[PDB]
Amino acid sequence: DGVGNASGDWHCDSTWMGDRVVTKSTRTWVLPSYNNHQYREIKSGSVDGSNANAYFGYSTPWGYFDFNRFHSHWSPRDWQRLINNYWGFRPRSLRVKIFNIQV
Amino acid sequence: DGVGNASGDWHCDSTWMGDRVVTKSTRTWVLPSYNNHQYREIKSGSVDGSNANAYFGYSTPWGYFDFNRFHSHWSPRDWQRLINNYWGFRPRSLRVKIFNIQVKEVTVQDSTTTIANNLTSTVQVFTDDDYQLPYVVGNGTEGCLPAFPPQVFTLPQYGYATLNRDNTENPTERSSFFCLEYFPSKMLRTGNNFEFTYNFEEVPFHSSFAPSQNLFKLANPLVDQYLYRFVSTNNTGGVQFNKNLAGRYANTYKNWFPGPMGRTQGWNLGSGVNRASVSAFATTNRMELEGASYQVPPQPNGMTNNLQGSNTYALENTMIFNSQPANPGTTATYLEGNMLITSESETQPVNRVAYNVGGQMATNNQSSTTAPATGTYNLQEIVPGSVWMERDVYLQGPIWAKIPETGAHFHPSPAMGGFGLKHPPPMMLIKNTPVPGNITSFSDVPVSSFITQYSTGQVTVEMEWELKKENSKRWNPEIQYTNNYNDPQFVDFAPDSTGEYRTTRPIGTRYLTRPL
Amino acid sequence: DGVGNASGDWHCDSTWMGDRVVTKSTRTWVLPSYNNHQYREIKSGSVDGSNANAYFGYSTPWGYFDFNRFHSHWSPRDWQRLINNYWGFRPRSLRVKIFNIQV
Amino acid sequence: DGVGNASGDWHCDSTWMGDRVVTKSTRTWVLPSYNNHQYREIKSGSVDGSNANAYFGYSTPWGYFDFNRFHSHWSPRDWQRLINNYWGFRPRSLRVKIFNIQVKEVTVQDSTTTIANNLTSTVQVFTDDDYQLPYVVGNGTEGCLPAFPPQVFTLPQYGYATLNRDNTENPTERSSFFCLEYFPSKMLRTGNNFEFTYNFEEVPFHSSFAPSQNLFKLANPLVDQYLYRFVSTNNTGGVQFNKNLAGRYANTYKNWFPGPMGRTQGWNLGSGVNRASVSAFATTNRMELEGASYQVPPQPNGMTNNLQGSNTYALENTMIFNSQPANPGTTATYLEGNMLITSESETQPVNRVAYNVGGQMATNNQSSTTAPATGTYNLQEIVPGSVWMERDVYLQGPIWAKIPETGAHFHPSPAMGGFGLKHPPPMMLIKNTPVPGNITSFSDVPVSSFITQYSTGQVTVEMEWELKKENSKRWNPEIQYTNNYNDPQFVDFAPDSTGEYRTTRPIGTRYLTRPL
């Protein structure tokens, strides 16, 4: 759209609705330009006296979003509300949004 | 929308439409980035030799809009139009708007400090509609929309105290932390605006009239009572009565009683000698709570701090304002010449005088051997068939207070005046969304270097008030609030030669009278 | 109805249904014949050096059901489920039943 | 209904209808008043020099119906009709009925002990349908409906162990108490009856056939393999191969492997010398749990405890029953002559022998200087492409077990045989409703004197079973379970001269054969 209009809003919440609970988290991220835009082939030999440490691979100039920790979605208090009252739980869906970008 | 289009207009006004009046105010605010984007846990121990001063809490990086002062909505002249003509009023609705936002980036490279505007930055804004956060608005604190419309103000920083342990700086296992980023908020770029409406819950009209009769002298001064009274015993001890005569108010039977009172100390303003070199604190009225001693001005409702035509004031039963705004944390010793000391003398026909005893009563049992003895009292609470007048509202004072949620209260009318609300106008919080500086490598440790910036914008508040029309049959003319100054050197309630707004007097609300 | 048919069943339970919770309690009571079927006028003078202890009244041959204690309706565990999760509560209705009598 | 009308009828039967068979059993039960109507907390420390014996729990005043033994539903002759003709079977539904109740009051005044019936007393009954209570039914314990229909049985008392702390008698903060009066139950007077139905969840058929081939010799003995095998190295170290010939099963390539095994000790029954004066315990197979050492008979599935035509038995991999029922808490030393020792020898073509090593494997790396070395193993768990046969079901054994709720299990088939169920037939609990003695004054202290009494009634269980029809092309005749006794002194599975039911042998389930 445009420069002077915001592309999304801030949502942090927890909505308990019986058999479901929906968590929302918003964070502010910063992204460095990695490697100076190029792929590099990274590698290692036997480090610390262990060749299980050896590897061969590639670093890229990309970064990624990782939300695979519970504390990224649950507050200490909602976590307590979950473990003191339920016998189990499992994830059902996921929705992600990236907005308000600034280079 | 866009950068080159304005998101709202300027509205300042007052529209009187019979039973209603609608006020509109627009101001320009500026918002600093508080704390450098982070929450801090603030605390204090025993300060000034009082552990009631200890606390434990949190400052946040948010600021808030506070419009809980009458002068934020009323001009001196509309206030005069209200108090000279109506018997009461109460708030009905509220509409708020934040618009024309501008985020500015500040860079201080080589002591040049240049301010540029950042077109892509945001401010976050939300209203706490379920009252889930500590409500700090109605506690007589600074940072409200200014009295005078051209003034630009800084929004205050949101902070709160939670529970401290044993009158020390330490928290308790019950102390809570509230993260404000844990609520849903709107983000606004320079082309965006925020709007919010609210309706007040039915509250009683404020009573903007003074009583034209004294509560203890409501009987007709021409007729006697058909009731009698014990007046003595004869030389043998037999009881004797006398009829209550016409107009002998010191003896008539009464149906109603004055409101509750707790004796406060009285001091003389202007002419009138006081005890020299005193230190108030040590002898002020206190209430204990959790093991600490707190001063409790202005004392509970139901008293009068001044007796009309007298210079003795029960200073702690009084609202004391400054003639002008002061800097943060000033420790200057102001004198009477700098203050706007309010007086509730127009409630004296119904409210007991705070610096006098409240009455007296039987202390023993008389018999042929002992004479009846009596003893005065200094405090007396509510009794049935008690009546009093609530404290007055001033133009420079507070409009509402939140009634604390505890499940039990009596007559929810705030000591400082105004309306007591179960669900008051929600707090509106605002902050500059953080923008990280140059970060070149990865770290799991949170970013701590930000671009410094601030915002500014306009805010419009629109309140609808309902009025209670004055319906008197008084024949002679009434007292009115009037612009009376002997040899003015400057116009009051106007900017002076320097451009600073002057106000030399507190304007209350009771000019009209009514028979009890 | 009859001698060889039961007049009711045993119900003890707690049913949580969102905004409501319904508790049920069944107990077995025994009723003595009090006073030997007659009313008596009972009374006392000043006992333990206090005349606030004096009274005049009547005992009857009747007994009564009293369920005005929380533990008559709540188990320790349902009580815990209530005080760890709700901000308040209030009673809405009551239903009582006396059955399976045996003289 | 009423006192002079019966609430149900007697049904004992077996109805074979092709693919289904329906069994019905009725028995007469008696129920004592347990504990004198109260819950007690029971516990034990380290008994017999083993703290695995310690526990903490609760006995209740309830008794329960347990019909988890095959002989509760099958007669010896219907069992024979099942194992000589079908390849498998599984339970489909269950229907239970309790009727013709009679409460008896017992009074022992002056050593006369008279029994009268109390027409107004009740029994409470309920089924735990949500599995909220500790399920004690499928753990090889006594108190099931008897084998023989004319026998009258006592219902066992419900009790359970919860958590004890550190292998001692003390509870932990996690130990739970379950009050059974906290469930909804029916009350039955002498004219009432209780009915209950249940459907089993789809389970795999039990496999009532023995394998007609050995798992390692499935190749055609007439053709060679087109695969070769390493057979040695020449005087220089170069490797040499040989073709896998026809019928040389010791070398062929295999596709499938025998099931898991954990070596158990083997003992000789009848003829066959054993080590004299031994004390099994000290050297039995154990598993540790929470710091204690437990014996684990009958060991996990996948082994065979006996090799056909041999008298060596891996006794702890064996189900050992008594030829008759015993009194509670007997410490007698039974000999082989009193037991019904089961044998799983008909699984030997697929299951490894429990008292032998499981195989061997490479222990080093050969080189010009070291010769290849190998070492045998005593235990080996599951590998991919493993096959084994589950333990057999006996007429005197258990039908099902509850699979413990933990969220993680592997191949839920109980060590003692039978069906493993997520949701098994719910427990049916029953108790005599207490009746207070003569109470003349009031007390807040709970009543502790009751009229002593007991109940009795009939119980009918109706189970539907689904059968898997045998579909063989074997030419020669098969092995069948047959009534074969040389010079019988009494009829087996019949009452003797005293009236006591005799059973001299465990009847398993695998008589029919199938090619692998």
Written as one string, the DSSP assignment of B380-401 is E---TTEE--PPP--TTS--EE
- Please say whether the beta carbons of D341 and D416 come within 8 A: no
Please say whether the beta carbons of D393 and D347 come within 8 A.
Answer: no
Count contacts between A and B (CB, < 8 Å).
Answer: 68
Q: Report yes or no: B190 at the A interface, CB cutoff 8 Å.
A: yes
SS3 C2: coil
Which phi and psi (to 5°) does residue A82 adopt?
-80, -45
Residues in chain D: 516
CB B510 within 8 Å of CB B346? yes
* Direct distance between the N- and C-terminal alpha carbons of chain C, in angstroms, rounded to an integer: 16
Nearest Cα residue to D97 out of D201, D24, D150: D24
SS3 of residue B283 by DSSP: helix
Question: DSSP character for D132?
Answer: -
Is the Cβ–Cβ distance between D57 and D171 less than 8 Å?
no
C-alpha–C-alpha distance, residues B70 and B400, integer Å: 10
A38 touches chain C (CB under 8 A): no
Residue of B120, B184, B192 with shortest CB distance to A102: B120
3-class DSSP assignment, residue D237: coil
Q: Tally C-beta pairs within 8 A across A and C.
A: 5
Looking at the complex, does the CB of residue A30 fall below 8 Å from at least one CB of chain B?
yes
CA-wise closest residue to D435 among D44, D58, D103 = D103
* Interface residue C38 vs chain A (CB under 8 A): no
* Alpha-carbon gap: C50 to the closest alpha carbon of chain D (Å): 26
> B508, B83 in Cβ contact below 8 A?
yes
For residue B180, give how far its alpha carbon lies from the nearest alpha carbon of chain A (Å): 10
User: Degrees (nearest 5) of the Cα angle B411, B413, B418?
Assistant: 160
Contacting residues for C82 by C-beta, under 8 A, at least 6 apart: C21, C74, C89
* Region label for B509, one of left (φ > 0), alpha (ψ between -120 and 50) or beta (otherwise): alpha
**Could you give the CA distance from residue B22 to residue B15 in angstroms, rounded to a whole number?**
5
Sign of CA dihedral D52, D53, D54, D59: positive
B247 Cβ contact partners less than 8 Å away, ≥ 6 residues apart: B219, B221, B222
Tell me which chain C residue has its CA closest to the CA of residue D4.
C4
| CB spacing of D186 vs C9 below 8 angstroms | yes
CA-based nearest distance C38→chain A, Å: 54
Beta carbons within 10 angstroms of residue D450's beta carbon: 15
Interface of A with B in 41-60 (CB under 8 A): none
Cβ within 8 Å of residue D90, ≥6 positions away: D200, D203, D204, D205, D206, D419, D465, D466
Exposed/middle/buried for D111, CB within 10 Å: 0-12, 13-18, 19+?
exposed
The rounded Cα B370 to chain-centroid distance in angstroms is 51
**Backbone φ, ψ for residue D163 (5° rounding):** -95, 135
**C13 burial type by CB count under 10 A (0-12 exposed, 13-18 middle, 19+ buried):** middle
Long-range contacts of D432-440 (CB under 8 A, 24+ apart): D432/D31, D432/D33, D432/D103, D432/D121, D432/D122, D432/D123, D433/C28, D433/C100, D433/D121, D433/D122, D433/D123, D433/D124, D433/D187, D434/C28, D434/D33, D434/D37, D435/C102, D435/D118, D435/D121, D436/C28, D436/C30, D439/C30, D439/C32, D440/C32
| Triad B169, B173, B176: Cα angle to 5° | 80
Q: How far is A81 from chain C (nearest CA, A)?
A: 8
Please report, as a single letter, which amino acid is at residue A26.
T
Q: Which residue of D has its CA nearest to C32?
A: D440
Q: What is the CA radius of gyration of chain C?
A: 20
Helix (H, G, I), strand (E, B), or coil: what is residue C82?
A: helix
| Residue D236 forms contact with C (CB below 8 Å) | no
B183 to chain A, any CB pair closer than 8 A? The answer is yes
Domain range for B215 is 1-516
Residue D487, number of CB atoms within 10 A of its CB: 4
D439 chain-C contacts, CB cut-off 8 A: 30, 32
Cβ–Cβ of C6/D188 closer than 8 Å?
yes
Flag if C10 and D186 touch (Cβ within 8 Å). Answer: yes
A6 to B188: CB separation less than 8 angstroms, yes or no: yes
Residues D3 and D191: beta-carbon distance below 8 Å? yes
Three-class DSSP category at D77:
helix
What is the sign of the dihedral through the CA atoms of B496, B500, B503 and B509? Answer: positive
Tokens 């189970």 locate to D463
Q: Which residues of C touch A81 (CB under 8 A)?
A: 85
- Kindly list the residues from chain A whose CB atom is less than 8 angstroms away from the CB atom of residue B434: 28
Whether A22 has its CB under 8 Å from any CB of chain B: the answer is: no
Contact A10 B187 (CB under 8 A): yes
Q: H or E stretch including B246?
A: none
Measured between CA atoms, the residue of chain A closest to residue B192 is: A5
- What is the count of structural domains for chain D? 1
Is B442's CB within 8 Å of A75's CB? Answer: no
Chain B interface, best mutation among A7, A9, A29, by max B CB count within 10 A: A9
Do chains B and D touch by CB distance (3+ pairs < 8 Å)? no
- B219's enclosing H/E stretch is none
**Structure solved via:** cryo-EM
Give counts: helices (H), strands (E), chain C: 1, 4
Report the distance separating Cα D404 and Cα B27, nearest Å.
69
Enumerate the residues of chain D whose CB falls inside 8 A of the CB of residue C102. Answer: 120-121, 435
C102 touches D: beta carbon within 8 Å: yes
C-alpha torsion sign, points D221, D226, D227, D232: positive
**CB contact A76 to B (< 8 Å):** no
Distance from CA of D278 to the nearest CA of C (A): 51
Instruction: Please tell me if residue A84 touches chain C, with a CB cutoff of 8 Å.
Output: yes
User: Contact partners of B by the rule of 3+ C-beta pairs under 8 A?
Assistant: A
Chain A: residue whose CA lies nearest to B177: A77
- Interchain CB distance below 8 Å, C30 and D439: yes
